[PDB]
Structure formats: structure tokens, C-alpha cells
Symmetry: C2
Subunit: 140 residues, 2 copies
Amino acid sequence: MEIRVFRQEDFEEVITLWERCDLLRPWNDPEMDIERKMNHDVSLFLVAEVNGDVVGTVMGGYDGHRGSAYYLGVHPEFRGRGIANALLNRLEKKLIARGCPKIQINVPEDNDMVLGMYERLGYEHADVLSLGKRLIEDEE
Amino acid sequence: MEIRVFRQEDFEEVITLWERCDLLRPWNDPEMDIERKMNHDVSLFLVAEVNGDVVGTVMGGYDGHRGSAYYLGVHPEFRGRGIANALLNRLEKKLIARGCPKIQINVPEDNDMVLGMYERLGYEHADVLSLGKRLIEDEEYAGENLYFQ
């Protein structure tokens, strides 16, 4: 199992994996999200590969003040193998390497698995409300 | 009132404004924070200038999926002039201009005024928990600064 940067050739395989991990939402066009990432900086968009197949992802990022992580997924048949942790551990190292001082992540309260992973990785709850505003509406 | 990008020359004036606006925290060194933006991409770090002086800021940003905003402040003597709204609108337009599809801003839980303000600007509260992990410890640096003593 190896962690590496996303490549353009992984496009369709990643989208299929996201579908299999129930990560897609109607308001985010995954094709558009990958294109945005490619255009901006692909270097923190990581994939986990096992036997030549992409079985996990994290779309990591840095905005010049805080790090981020979206689209964290592990194929349902590859759970309990340390892949999500390997992805986040590598992301954190890439973030520190470029001077990012802190990573932030939002998770729905009902996602007890993702929440639990982050708590075990040393993430702490922030006493804040996350407010959002859509700027460009995607198609489904 | 001119909204423009932060420049090197604004460095001290902005830190003084942040101190005045009670935006400094012990765990974020403002010189380090500004240097990080300079090194990464200064373009979404906006300032508002009135009569030649910097009176407002927003440290905007984009990570390739979502936009962000930190260090939003307006000098106390320049309130009621729409400066915060003008800064945020300009940031949102710069974000749109580069294809950013959404901006998200975290606000303290106990600030109903600030929550109300953002709701009126078209922001909505997300049903999520917010977690964080410090990666580099600014407060461990032993250099002493003239600001925030």
C-alpha cells in the first residue's frame, strides 16, 4: 500500500471510488472538483494505491494560513488496513514541509467513523460555527 | 475608501490594526502569518484604505476547493461605513473570478451578532463539527516582539 499524488489518469477511477464511498453530494460536481484542484495545485491531492488500484483518497489543501482535507474515502473492501490514517499522516507531513501551521476539518456529527479517526489523530473540537456561502452553483 | 491587495509596506500598520481590533492571539504570530501569505499567494489578502491609512483587512484564501477568510477587522473609529461588507464582497468576487465555488468562515459559537451579520450576507450555518490540529507552534518561537506585549 503506497500513498502518492493524484494524476490526471486517475480521474474516472477516483470518481468511481467516491461513489462507492458515498462521498458524492448533488451540489458538488466531482468532475468539477477534480478540475478545480488540478488547476489550483494538485500536490496535496493524495491517493492510496494497492495492487495497482486506487483504494483511498484525501483531497488535501493549503490556503496560506490553514490546511484542509476533503473527499477522504477508503474503498469499502479495504477498511481496517490503516489507509485513512496513512493518508492523513502523509498529508500532515506535506503540510508541515511547506510551512502550514494548522489543519482544520469539518465533519458531520453523525459520521462517527471519520470523527473517531480525527479524534484518535489528535484533532480537537473547535467551539465555532462553520458558515458557508455558495459562489458558483454546480450542476448535478 | 479603496479596497486593494496587501503590500509589503503595510506590514507594521496591519499588525497594529489587528492589535487594536483584538484579533491577535498568543498562538498565531502575526509576522509569521503574514509571511506565510506572502510566500503562498498574497492576492486574496485585502486591505481597505481611507485617507491613506489601512483601516480594514480580510486575509482571504483559496485551497483549490473552498475559499476562506481570516483576520477580518475594521478599525473601531471606522465602523458604520460598510468596510467589512465591502472587503468580503470584493473577496467573494476575486474568488469567483478564479473559479472558487464556495467560501466558508468559522465564527465563535457565542457571537449571535457576528452570526446574524453573516446570515444577512447570504451565509448559512453548516450542520457539522469543526476540528483542528496545530502543526507548527508559533508560540514556541522565543523571539520577542514590540507588539502584543
